[PDB]
């Protein structure tokens, strides 16, 4: 009933995406980024993160990395599934992405899962070890939803990242554009 309700939630979001993110225009595309960055900001305001990095990768993938606690990976009673899987299968960003990957650094372990249109492609797996904590989310916006454009605008991302850092002082937020490997741009904000 848990995983059935998951699938029904994905179908709902993909049927009426603008009801979830405002629009499927360039504005909605950028809202995907905001949805993930907002989660990282909450983790900083909880006392647990102080560095957020947004990268526009080749072919307009987005990677958001924070140094928070890591999304938890313990098995839930509610679902019988790892908590990160529950959190990401109920994510609007995930449902509206053709592909999304998560890497969690927690318990000195690196955990990975990948999804397509919100559906897990394999069970969460341990892939390596670490001495850090935090979460990496990489996603590619689904062009079946974002039918006008899937190309991000650096200046749009930059303006709002700068605003976020000014508003949440002490958080270092970095934007980087790696789309053109020959000319990489990076802006790094850190107020007080």
From Swiss-Prot:
Any one Gene Ontology BP term: DNA topological change
Main localization of the protein described in the UniProt heading: cytoplasm
A molecular-function term among this protein's GO annotations: metal ion binding
Keyword Cytoplasm among record annotations: yes
Localization terms from the record: Cytoplasm
GO cellular component: chromosome; cytoplasm
Keywords (A to Z) from UniProt: Antibiotic resistance, ATP-binding, Cytoplasm, DNA-binding, Isomerase, Magnesium, Metal-binding, Nucleotide-binding, Topoisomerase
Cited function: A type II topoisomerase that negatively supercoils closed circular double-stranded (ds) DNA in an ATP-dependent manner to modulate DNA topology and maintain chromosomes in an underwound state. Negative supercoiling favors strand separation, and DNA replication, transcription, recombination and repair, all of which involve strand separation. Also able to catalyze the interconversion of other topological isomers of dsDNA rings, including catenanes and knotted rings. Type II topoisomerases break and join 2 DNA strands simultaneously in an ATP-dependent manner.
Record's miscellaneous remark: Few gyrases are as efficient as E.coli at forming negative supercoils. Not all organisms have 2 type II topoisomerases; in organisms with a single type II topoisomerase this enzyme also has to decatenate newly replicated chromosomes.
Subunit relationships: Heterotetramer, composed of two GyrA and two GyrB chains. In the heterotetramer, GyrA contains the active site tyrosine that forms a transient covalent intermediate with DNA, while GyrB binds cofactors and catalyzes ATP hydrolysis.
Family: Belongs to the type II topoisomerase GyrB family.
Identification of the protein by name: DNA gyrase subunit B
